[PDB]
């Protein structure tokens with residue numbers, strides 16, 4: 293157990309597992325058009341990052357025993373560096389994709405969103421690969437004037453910069469998650485206000501002998517409906533808007549009795565629409581909850597190492613290194629599992645192949 297070679301073969305098999313599952317997920321995102329939305333494209337990018345993690349550690353074992361050259365091991369640590377950086381970057385990317393999709397989904401138009409998503413993938417993979425290559429350029433720890441970090445051949449200075457960057461990145465991701473929550477809080481609160489106003493309007497319509505009270509209540513009802521529509525395009529209540537338009541038409545041309553009757557008929561469509569929006573908000577809560585779980589798991593798995601690699605002592609037992617990498621490494625293993633157990637849309641494809649086979 294405390295032995296490093298048994299640990300090494302253990303992590304070798306685990307990284308084989310990790311690379312396989314990540315490759316499967318990337319294939320599903322690339323092959324399924326239903327999974328081609330910004331969110332799932334970014335999720336596939338993270339799958340690729342964890343794939344790189346598994347592949348890099350497999351290669352690091354493969355060479356570690358029976359390697360041709362150290363140069364290659366330096367490149368493979370570049371691999372692991374790139375996997376970590378891509379994972380963290382794409383995680384922030386999914387956070388912002390969620391925040392943008394929910395903040396004002398109408399502004400979540402295809403042009404800027406597809407532009408942003410492809411830009412995010414480019415700026416993530418470019419940066420991550422550049423970092424992974426930096427130790428190749430001469431940013432490693434193999435000099436008589438440079439101290440080696442726990443993960444050779446990475447220097448303590450550069451791993452320290454990586455750790456501090458990761459900490460600040462994680463803090464920013466947390467703030468963005470809280471902004472996301474705020475957005476959803478408001479989307480629900482404004483809807484509750486509109487329900488109060490709409491029920492008050494329907495109530496006050498019945499108790500009025502003047503044709504102008506009906507017009508006022510119907511206009512306020514229309515405004516409330518249009519606000520609720522503005523909240524989230526992401527199954528149509530434009531029908532309710534149209535029924536309110538019919539009621540307004542009748543009300544204007546001196547049709548009080550039948551205008552009130554139409555405002556009553558609005559009750560059926562209002563029941564349907566109010567039943568509708570609740571499912572939407574439940575789905576939003578589910579997606580945001582999955583985001584939160586993923587963030588928590590990533591932090592818990594990596595922060596141990598993120599701290600140790602800097603506070604490491606260069607004379608401590610080897611076990612500490614494992615105890616910090618084992619969470620961090622198996623984070624790549626656990627990430628594929630989460631979405632499957634939770635995200636139903638991609639879980640569908642997971643079970644689809646069995647129908648195929």
Ligand SMILES: CC(=O)N1CCc2nc(N3CCC(Oc4ccc(F)cc4F)CC3)c(N[C@@H]3CCOC3)nc2C1
Pocket residue numbers: 345346349352369372373375376443444445450451452454455456458594597598599601617620621622624
């Ligand atoms: C000798 C040996 O056992 N090797 C060779 C070197 C090695 N390097 C790893 N990475 C390198 C980059 C580093 O990134 C940072 C992470 C946190 C920081 F705060 C600052 C960093 F810079 C994380 C650790 C690593 N981790 C993998 C990643 C996926 O599962 C475990 N496994 C190994 C295996």
